[PDB]
Amino acid sequence: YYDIDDVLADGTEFPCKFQYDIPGLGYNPGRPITKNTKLSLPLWLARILAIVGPVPFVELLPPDMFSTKVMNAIKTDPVALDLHSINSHFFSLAIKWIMLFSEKELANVVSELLLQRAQELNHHASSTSTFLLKLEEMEKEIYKKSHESYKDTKRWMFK
Amino acid sequence: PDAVFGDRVRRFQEFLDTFTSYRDSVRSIQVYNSNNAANYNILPHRIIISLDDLREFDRSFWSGILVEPAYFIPPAEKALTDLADSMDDVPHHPWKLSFKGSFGAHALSPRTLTAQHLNKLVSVEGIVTKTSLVRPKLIRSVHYAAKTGRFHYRDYTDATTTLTTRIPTPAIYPTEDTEGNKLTTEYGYSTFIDHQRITVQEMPEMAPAGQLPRSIDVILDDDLVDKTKPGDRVNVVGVFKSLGAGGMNQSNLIGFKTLILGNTVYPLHAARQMLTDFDIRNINKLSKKKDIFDILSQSLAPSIYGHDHIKKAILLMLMGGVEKNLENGSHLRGDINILMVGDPSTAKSQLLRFVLNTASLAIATTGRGSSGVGLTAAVTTDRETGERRLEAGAMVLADRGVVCIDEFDKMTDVDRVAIHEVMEQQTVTIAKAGIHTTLNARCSVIAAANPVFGQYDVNRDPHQNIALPDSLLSRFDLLFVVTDDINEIRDRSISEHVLRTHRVTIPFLRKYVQYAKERVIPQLTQEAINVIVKNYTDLRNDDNTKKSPITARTLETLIRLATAHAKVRLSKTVNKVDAKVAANLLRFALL
Amino acid sequence: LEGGALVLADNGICCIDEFDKMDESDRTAIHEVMEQQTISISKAGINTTLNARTSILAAANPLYGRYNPRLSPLDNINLPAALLS
Amino acid sequence: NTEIIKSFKNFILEFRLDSQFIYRDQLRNNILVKNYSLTVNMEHLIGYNEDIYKKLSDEPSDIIPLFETAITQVAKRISINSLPTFQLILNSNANQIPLRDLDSEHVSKIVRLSGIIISTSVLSSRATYLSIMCRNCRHTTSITINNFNTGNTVSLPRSCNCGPDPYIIIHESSKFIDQQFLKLQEIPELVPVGEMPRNLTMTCDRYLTNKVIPGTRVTIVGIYSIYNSKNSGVAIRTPYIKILGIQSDVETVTMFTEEEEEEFLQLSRNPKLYEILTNSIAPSIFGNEDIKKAIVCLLMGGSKKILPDGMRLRGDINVLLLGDPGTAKSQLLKFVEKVSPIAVYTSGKGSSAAGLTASVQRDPMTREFYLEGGAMVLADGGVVCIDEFDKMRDEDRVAIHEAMEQQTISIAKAGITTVLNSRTSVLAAANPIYGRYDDLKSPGDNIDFQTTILSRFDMIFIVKDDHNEERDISIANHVINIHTGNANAMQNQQEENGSEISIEKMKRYITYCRLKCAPRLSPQAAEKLSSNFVTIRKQLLINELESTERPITIRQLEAIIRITESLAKLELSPIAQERHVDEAIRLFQASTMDAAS
Ligand SMILES: Nc1ncnc2c1ncn2[C@@H]1O[C@H](COP(=O)(O)OP(=O)(O)OP(=O)(O)O)[C@@H](O)[C@H]1O
Ligand SMILES: Nc1ncnc2c1ncn2[C@@H]1O[C@H](COP(=O)(O)OP(=O)(O)OP(=O)(O)O)[C@@H](O)[C@H]1O
């Protein structure tokens, strides 16, 4: 869709092996790619790739960003975790996969992390140091709204 | 004891009952412990636990161990040993827990530490240096009172005892216990722990811009002792101990010597390694091809043009060359050593960085250098308790590994004479004050040197162009001169890849080679001999009218070279087919 | 004091390498070791001359890089004439 | 004594400078931060109460604890556990004092001062709180160091038989802090006379620590005092000084204010943004703009390419100032050091006592060993100025050959063999041999003998000073104008007013820039260049067809490549321009000309 991040969300390569042989390799001279060839794929294509069958066209292996080592690591110190490092496009992204695979488990998990970041990021509302760098872009923008919110507020405060 | 201690133990029931995977693992220890009991008429008590379960168990008990492990831990210590009793109580003792993590906060490197991170179990990683050597330490004591008999008993607690602070109780040592009978020291019934202490420097890779690294200490006890040599890359995890006075201990500035105790300290490669099946089968699949080796060659120079013959020699050096030691006689040198030479901007030193990475052992060298390089240089005086302790230099520290040398020509000849001892003899010899020993350095080695004078490395004769006479020439199995000669046809090739520079898999290689190292040595086959005998002889029969030096040592390399390719082929036996490869690079060695 | 080498090798053969690199300090000693049956130290308060019965053999390398047939004898050798005599 | 607390608490609350009060703001501002800190303006403090300032100034050390224990009070109001005491830093810029004069009178007197630090100690703990128990009575107690001037100030009380002082340390329950132990030296300019500059150990605690890079020019405040120690007399104590606060001239520190980016954006928009810097480097200097221009390209930092494998592009290049005296190149580098945020001026030999080789030195006590430091390490990741490079001893001169490329030094001295990282950008000013005639000679036959020394160098400049009448009289008078009434110096104001760089801000600009953009060349620039040097590679060999001896390397081209990002970095653009590249060609062509001679 029209948000740069929307198309930006589909751009990252996703390591999904196909269910079928595919003559006319889009990437090269297979020409067909043998069934269960493991390859990273852009989300947009991969979005509907296995969506058509009735068996799905791609096995669609789960993201390393979603690794159990990731999902547990976040359980420790999300405040300390660098989301700018992980993807960095994540919540706007993972929601797609979580929309894609339709799992509730990490959802009940990650959403809280979103809050955990939020609480402290609310501390940033006051007017640094190094934490600001680890924020995701969508996670980064949120502050712009808040920073200027009080900025004009305090600048409004006097004269 | 507070139920807070008894409850935390009681709080550890359902865990590790769930996850119960550790329950039988300790039982797996129980059995093997029983196993050894079966044969003799070895495993450490301490067990690994992924911290993670606490997040599915107690998040308060979770972070608390990260907060006040000093408290939560000791009860967890009991239940393990306690259940350890229940696990096997039939037949007639720290039982520590590691925690890989499940991190972290508490994830920090040594360069950035505390004051808050103090008194908390934390992962910290880096070089192992300088790693104080081990000494034995008692805890329990026992005695006999004659003539009334019975048996005496005594316990001890130091400053580094357990985890938490406890009342210091140096006892001297138990004697004449009432009634006043003579008490003879009794041992082996009494308890002992060999003690170890080491610091660790933070990585220069992760080191900041303009500042020096600060290595920080950690205690090593029981199995924790001697798990690793000094200089290693490893991540230590444990609570940070602040014990000791601030000068207040004696009424009268700086204060509080401090270090982390325990726990895991997982060795880290940045060897090891896991292999499995799928992976090694690629090795098993790739091994069949005789076409693989050039691929092995081409993968070596991602940024580098050609010199593939120079490349081929590198992997053949990775093989090790199949050391064969004489029975009750001296071994001939197994491994191969080489030196890159040629006009400036060769990217020879650049190549060493490639030699510097996947190689995994070992340290390189740029010119000077010393005093001693791999020499211990007699670490002294004392250090500690009046005890003289040598600490091996890089050349020793690099044993069973790679040695790269930059500016080898600039290096002082003083230690060069030692490099004769370093290379031909392939062992270290030491007498200084001092300790008197000869220790093995078999380390694989390579160096690099500029032309003696200017760009004339082409025109002027290669002799007088060596820059480091004489036997130094005999030592190296290969010396490749790099001509700086330029061609527009060449430069045209030189551009785009240099252009693509700014804008088959490598890691698979070192796994392919590492397993290729212990399996399997090709030994020897006369068929390889049949052609090479006419070869090397003919080499002395021709080359001596062309170049030099020419020695049987160069012939000895032929066995090394073919030995390596036989490994490159993963051949269980040598083949004459490999010699043509070695001879050709040896042809390229001359030309 | 701890002696060795020549003092240790006395009444027996002494094998030797890098004989050209033994420099002067060795040469004069073995120069005297050719006078044999003696080792002379006037150093410190030590005035002693101790018997060295050592059998002597050392192999040494020709002038760099290797010997040149055009090179005349004794020009090729790196050792002193009185040492070879 | 007591209740003087509320008076600060009053100024903590009662104070409002219109329209908005500060420190009360700063507190909550630090609250969510968990900063646990306050920076006080002392010159501001007098504005509140005239009495308490000097009332504080009388024995400031004793009223130190009267603050942070007070600041927590309403902070605790605002907090509504555990809550460690905040760290206050008061500061003043008003009367700066020379290091040359420290009078015992100044003991327990707060003094703001400029300074140049030699170094600082590795951090060590101090326990702000501790629990302690009788080794006998089983009696439970707790103690704190609430504040301190090291004394040692406190010890174990001996009143629990049981004794003596049976109470003992408990570290787990105890809570801790840190100290830097800075060693600061006076500014070299004045007033050492013929005597060597005094050096002083400054005490940094908690937040004070890690706040300053070693060797940096800094302004600091704190209290004069003396510690007996032992490790003097009769009964004489060694001098030491508290650091509070230290407000140091920025940076002198990766972070900066946001509006700075914008004012730079104003600079980034300028079409002359590069060309104005061409003038800024040489306010007093006249001509040699090419070499003058060749300065800036190195100023922005070299190409760092770390992508696998571990092979990485280096920085920043190499440059040679060689030419007859009257080149003003040594005078040039003196400007160079001033322009670099971190740089080392070296005319040696070494400079001044510094080992041109970073070298090993033993610890006096407890034996052991450590890196003694080296100029490459001192300035690492920054500018390098070198004079007498031809006068350099060739042995450690060898180490230079390594230092420039691999950019990592390693020594086996003693037991510590570790390989240090050196990212510095060196520039060689060494004077050519025999004046003019060496140009009548080969371009070589100057540095050492071999040009292999030149091989490691990138842009090497041979100054040709020609005696042209009009050319001299221009700068000739330009010289007099440099002098009283400093007519040229007043010209910069209008240049400061209208356009021209202030160069201290520019340093911040560069430091801004150096960390900001990572320019990657456009694909067509390279092919434009690939087609370029292949000619140059082919052409100079056509000069080599005569067997003429002088030179060329593929490293020669790579150096040029770093020029691509060089000015482009000034542009701030993500990728190198096609057009942008060309000036690098003709500029390096002027460098190639030196080979042409
Ligand atoms: N085969 C090659 N492939 C790519 N680049 C090369 C090659 N040979 C030389 N170069 C270039 O030449 C330069 C070599 O610089 P480097 O510092 O690596 O030289 P070095 O190995 O130290 O040689 P020396 O010891 O003679 O200085 C690099 O910029 C590199 O890009
Ligand atoms: N382009 C120039 N701009 C300003 N002054 C100059 C210029 N060229 C020469 N001078 C004057 O000439 C004198 C040169 O003295 P200086 O000591 O700087 O020479 P140098 O080139 O640094 O010496 P060396 O050649 O030994 O490095 C200075 O007083 C300087 O003002």
From Swiss-Prot, chain A:
Entry-linked Gene3D superfamilies: 1.20.58.2050
One Pfam family here: PSF3_N
Compartment list: Nucleus
Highest taxon of the lineage: Eukaryota
Keywords: DNA replication, Nucleus
Family classification: Belongs to the GINS3/PSF3 family.
Summary of the function given for this chain in its UniProt record: Functions as part of the GINS complex which plays an essential role in the initiation of DNA replication by binding to DNA replication origins and facilitating the assembly of the DNA replication machinery.
Protein name per the record: DNA replication complex GINS protein PSF3
Organism in which the protein naturally occurs: Saccharomyces cerevisiae (strain ATCC 204508 / S288c)
Species lineage: Eukaryota, Fungi, Dikarya, Ascomycota, Saccharomycotina
Gene of this entry: PSF3
Curated annotation (Swiss-Prot), chain B:
Domain called MCM: residue spans: 292-499
Any GO MF annotation of the entry: DNA replication origin binding
The protein, known as: DNA replication licensing factor MCM3
Compartments it resides in: Nucleus
Motif Arginine finger, residue numbers: 474-477
Gene Ontology CC: chromosome, telomeric region; CMG complex; cytoplasm; DNA replication preinitiation complex; MCM complex; nuclear pre-replicative complex; nuclear replication fork; nucleoplasm
Result for mutant: K348A: No effect on MCM2-7 complex helicase activity. Loss of MCM2-7 complex helicase activity. Reduces MCM2-7 complex helicase activity
Organism: Saccharomyces cerevisiae (strain ATCC 204508 / S288c) (Baker's yeast)
The family this protein is said to belong to: Belongs to the MCM family.
Alphabetical UniProt keywords: ATP-binding, DNA replication, DNA-binding, Helicase, Hydrolase, Nucleotide-binding, Nucleus, Phosphoprotein
UniProtKB/Swiss-Prot annotation, chain C:
Compartments reported by the entry: Cytoplasm; Nucleus
UniProt-annotated binding residues for ATP 1: N61
Assembly behavior: Component of the MCM2-7 complex. The complex forms a toroidal hexameric ring with the proposed subunit order MCM2-MCM6-MCM4-MCM7-MCM3-MCM5; loaded onto DNA, forms a head-head double hexamer. Interacts with CSM1 and MCM10.
UniProt record similarity statement: Belongs to the MCM family.
Miscellaneous comment in the UniProt entry for this protein: Present with 166 molecules/cell in log phase SD medium.
Function statement: Acts as a component of the MCM2-7 complex (MCM complex) which is the putative replicative helicase essential for 'once per cell cycle' DNA replication initiation and elongation in eukaryotic cells. Core component of CDC45-MCM-GINS (CMG) helicase, the molecular machine that unwinds template DNA during replication, and around which the replisome is built.
Listed name of the protein: DNA replication licensing factor MCM7
Species in which this protein is naturally found: Saccharomyces cerevisiae (strain ATCC 204508 / S288c) (Baker's yeast)
Residue numbers of the full-length protein present here: 508 to 592 of 845
Swiss-Prot record, chain D:
Short motif Arginine finger, span: 455-458
Enzyme Commission number(s) of this protein: 3.6.4.12
Enzyme class: hydrolase
SS bond partners: none
Subcellular location, principal: nucleus
Domain MCM span(s) in chain numbering: 273-480
Transmembrane residue ranges: none
Residues noted as binding ATP in the record, renumbered to the chain: G323, D324, P325, G326, T327, A328, K329, S330
GO BP annotation list: DNA replication initiation; double-strand break repair via break-induced replication; heterochromatin formation; nuclear DNA replication; pre-replicative complex assembly involved in nuclear cell cycle DNA replication; premeiotic DNA replication; regulation of DNA-templated DNA replication initiation; subtelomeric heterochromatin formation
Quaternary assembly: Component of the MCM2-7 complex. The complex forms a toroidal hexameric ring with the proposed subunit order MCM2-MCM6-MCM4-MCM7-MCM3-MCM5; loaded onto DNA, forms a head-head double hexamer. Interacts with CSM1.
Protein name from the UniProt record: Minichromosome maintenance protein 5
Gene giving rise to this polypeptide: MCM5
